[PDB]
């Protein structure tokens, strides 16, 4: 359970992301796909992209970055009371998109890296620990719905 102090750190940095959702979305997806190429293969939409420059040029990938960070932002702003927003996301990611929990760990690492690069004055170590705990809570609750459906592995 995050404390109120920790939620404040999280959402303070997140408000900064909200000034340039698309730029962040791009940088996060690019880092995820460069860091962990097996993730790119889960998107039939993007698996033609073979270089970072092609990724950076893809308007469709920038569109999807906005979709992902708008959904994450809505879950963060519920401060833990996010069951209505995770249900559908876990459902689709386990049964339709087939994303293992470990790749949710990978995208959390890429979110933390991009927020440290773009917002270092609002993302010192207190705020990095808090964002880590928020993203862990997201993964714990998606993992519990996976397990329900037979996809925790
Ligand atoms: C912060 C973590 C994530 C969030 C909030 C998120 C959010 C979303 C949303 C809102 C959609 C469209 C609605 C839906 O299908 O449920 C979506 C689609 C999808 N996501 Fe995620 N996602 C995350 C992590 C990932 C990861 C780590 C992968 C793959 C490694 C992935 C793969 C997919 C795929 C394949 C689609 C369908 C894209 C398409 O072909 O249109 N997601 N995601």
From Swiss-Prot:
It comes from the Eukaryota. InterPro entries: Globin (IPR000971), Globin-like_sf (IPR009050), Myoglobin (IPR002335). Its EC number is 1.7.-.-, 1.11.1.-. One of its GO terms (cellular component) is sarcoplasm. Nitrite binds at residue 64. It catalyses: Fe(III)-heme b-[protein] + nitric oxide + H2O = Fe(II)-heme b-[protein] + nitrite + 2 H(+); H2O2 + AH2 = A + 2 H2O. The keyword Heme applies. Its main location: cytoplasm. Keywords: Cytoplasm, Heme, Iron, Metal-binding, Muscle protein, Oxidoreductase, Oxygen transport, Phosphoprotein, Transport. Disulfide bonds: none annotated. SUPFAM superfamilies: Globin-like (SSF46458). The modification Phosphoserine is found at residue 3. The keyword Magnesium does not apply. It is found in: Cytoplasm, Sarcoplasm. Monomeric. Belongs to the globin family. Monomeric heme protein which primary function is to store oxygen and facilitate its diffusion within muscle tissues. Reversibly binds oxygen through a pentacoordinated heme iron and enables its timely and efficient release as needed during periods of heightened demand. Depending on the oxidative conditions of tissues and cells, and in addition to its ability to bind oxygen, it also has a nitrite reductase activity whereby it regulates the production of bioactive nitric oxide. This is Myoglobin. It comes from Physeter macrocephalus. The gene is MB.
């Amino acid at each position: 359970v995050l404390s109120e102090g920790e939620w404040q750190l999280v959402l303070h940095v997140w408000a900064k992301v909200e000034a340039d959702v698309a730029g962040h979305g791009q940088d996060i997806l690019i880092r995820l796909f460069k860091s962990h190429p097996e993730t790119l293969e889960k998107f039939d939409r993007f698996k033609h992209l073979k270089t970072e420059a092609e990724m950076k040029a893809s308007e469709d990938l920038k569109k999807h970055g906005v979709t992902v960070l708008t959904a994450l932002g809505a879950i963060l702003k519920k401060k833990g009371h996010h069951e209505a927003e995770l249900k559908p996301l876990a459902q689709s990611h386990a049964t339709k998109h087939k994303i293992p929990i470990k790749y949710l760990e990978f995208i959390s690492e890429a979110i933390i890296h991009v927020l440290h690069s773009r917002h270092p004055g609002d993302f010192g170590a207190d705020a990095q620990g808090a964002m880590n705990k928020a993203l862990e809570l997201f993964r714990k609750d998606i993992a519990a719905k996976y397990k329900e459906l037979g996809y925790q592995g």
